[PDB]
Amino acid sequence: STNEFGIFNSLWFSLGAFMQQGCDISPRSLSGRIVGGVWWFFTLIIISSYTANLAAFLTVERMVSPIESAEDLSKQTEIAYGTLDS
Amino acid sequence: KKPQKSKPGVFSFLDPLAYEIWMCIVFAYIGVSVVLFLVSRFSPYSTNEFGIFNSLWFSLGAFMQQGCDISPRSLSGRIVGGVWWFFTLIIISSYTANLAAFLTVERMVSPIESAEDLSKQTEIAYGTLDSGSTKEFFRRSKIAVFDKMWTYMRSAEPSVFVRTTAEGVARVRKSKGKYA
Amino acid sequence: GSTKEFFRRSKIAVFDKMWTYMRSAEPSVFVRTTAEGVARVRKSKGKYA
Amino acid sequence: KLSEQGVLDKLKNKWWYDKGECGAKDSGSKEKTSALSLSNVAGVFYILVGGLGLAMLVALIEFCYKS
Numbered sequence: 054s055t056n057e058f059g060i061f062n063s064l065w066f067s068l069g070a071f072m073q074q075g076c077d078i079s080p081r082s083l084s085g086r087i088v089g090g091v092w093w094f095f096t097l098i099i100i101s102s103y104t105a106n107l108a109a110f111l112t113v114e115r116m117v118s119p120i121e122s123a124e125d126l127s128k129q130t131e132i133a134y135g136t137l138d139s
Numbered sequence: 140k141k142p143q144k145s146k147p148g149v150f151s152f153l154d155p156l157a158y159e160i161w162m163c164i165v166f167a168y169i170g171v172s173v174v175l176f177l178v179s180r181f182s183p184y185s186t187n188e189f190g191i192f193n194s195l196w197f198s199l200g201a202f203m204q205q206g207c208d209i210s211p212r213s214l215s216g217r218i219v220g221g222v223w224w225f226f227t228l229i230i231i232s233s234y235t236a237n238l239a240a241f242l243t244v245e246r247m248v249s250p251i252e253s254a255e256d257l258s259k260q261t262e263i264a265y266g267t268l269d270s271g272s273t274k275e276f277f278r279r280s281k282i283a284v285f286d287k288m289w290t291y292m293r294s295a296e297p298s299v300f301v302r303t304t305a306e307g308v309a310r311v312r313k314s315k316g317k318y319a
Numbered sequence: 320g321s322t323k324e325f326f327r328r329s330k331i332a333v334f335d336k337m338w339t340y341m342r343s344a345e346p347s348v349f350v351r352t353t354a355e356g357v358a359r360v361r362k363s364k365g366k367y368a
Numbered sequence: 369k370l371s372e373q374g375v376l377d378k379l380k381n382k383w384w385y386d387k388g389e390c391g392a393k394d395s396g397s398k399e400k401t402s403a404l405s406l407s408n409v410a411g412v413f414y415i416l417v418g419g420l421g422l423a424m425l426v427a428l429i430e431f432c433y434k435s
């Protein structure tokens with residue numbers, strides 16, 4: 054007779070599950086634990102995905118080209134051009 | 140050929156591991172829960188709550204590193220709780236490395252653009268319109284990066300020279316980026 | 320010696336780049352004796368070959 | 369006569385350089401990393417399933433110290 058899953062607790066179980074944190078609340082039903090199971094496997098991929106890509110930014114640098122091939126020169130209106138008189 | 144990206148499968152997230160590993164993970168997840176089930180449900184056992192509904196759930200929470208409700212209060216239960224923890228420590232950490240290994244290799248993949256890269260990339264073959272002005276421009280070439288091409292374009296097998304430009308566009312379209 | 324003359328009449332392009340460099344490096348990368356030639360390795364701690 | 373003017377050295381530059389090379393051209397961009405095999409992570413399973421059996425032996429020696 055203890056339904057501890059309110060609308061305000063269901064956010065809180067799901068949040069620390071996204072933030073790799075241990076929750077005091079656990080589902081106690083087969084219809085409940087399938088929800089918490091696949092939500093756990095979701096965040097396991099995503100945090101590893103965030104860690105993997107941010108390494109790839111820091112390992113391999115790639116400095117972008119602001120302007121290229123004179124079509125970008127027409128659309129860009131931040132830069133000032135320079136030419137030589139006489 | 141303009142390299143549009145190949146869309147992955149929906150089941151491409153698990154590509155850092157092999158699918159032979161993942162099937163062995165599930166077979167391990169089944170056996171570990173049942174071994175803990177026999178340890179827990181012993182004939183003199185007091186208050187040992189780890190049934191087949193709990194030990195299936197405890198090993199899942201231990202595998203996903205999201206804690207658990209309760210821990211096994213028995214020495215043989217702590218052994219299987221111990222080795223599953225060292226199991227799921229490695230498998231998660233090994234997944235993080237190979238997923239980083241895919242992405243660090245992928246950003247090192249650079250498109251050949253400066254024609255020195257084209258002078259060094261023997262994987263992509265390159266040819267010209269024969270009997271024009273391009274083929275003669277490499278004939279009387281005085282630059283070593285141009286000299287390597289005219290060394291190659293005369294010596295590549297088969298004929299990289301193409302009679303018409305429409306077929307010259309076609310050998311780009313047919314090779315899907317294997318030809319320049 | 321014989322090393323400096325071997326790069327003088329050089330016919331390999333990887334050797335040709337050195338003799339292009341060793342004549343043109345500043346200051347003198349040529350060393351009069353071998354004991355000082357070991358010493359410019361020891362002084363540079365890996366900055367010199 | 370050919371060596372003092374480097375005709376033979378150019379022929380050394382001729383025949384070993386024209387045959388195609390195997391250098392950094394296939395060490396440069398002919399690698400993509402594989403997935404992990406089972407054999408890379410196989411020994412974890414031996415510690416795991418070996419830990420499964422070692423849990424079973426201590427459960428049986430509790431049966432002696434319970435009786």
Ligand SMILES: N[C@@H](Cn1oc(=O)[nH]c1=O)C(=O)O
Pocket residue numbers: 268270271272273274304
């Ligand atoms: N139009 C050119 C022939 N040509 O077109 C190319 O795209 N390459 C080439 O040599 C000529 O007057 O010789």
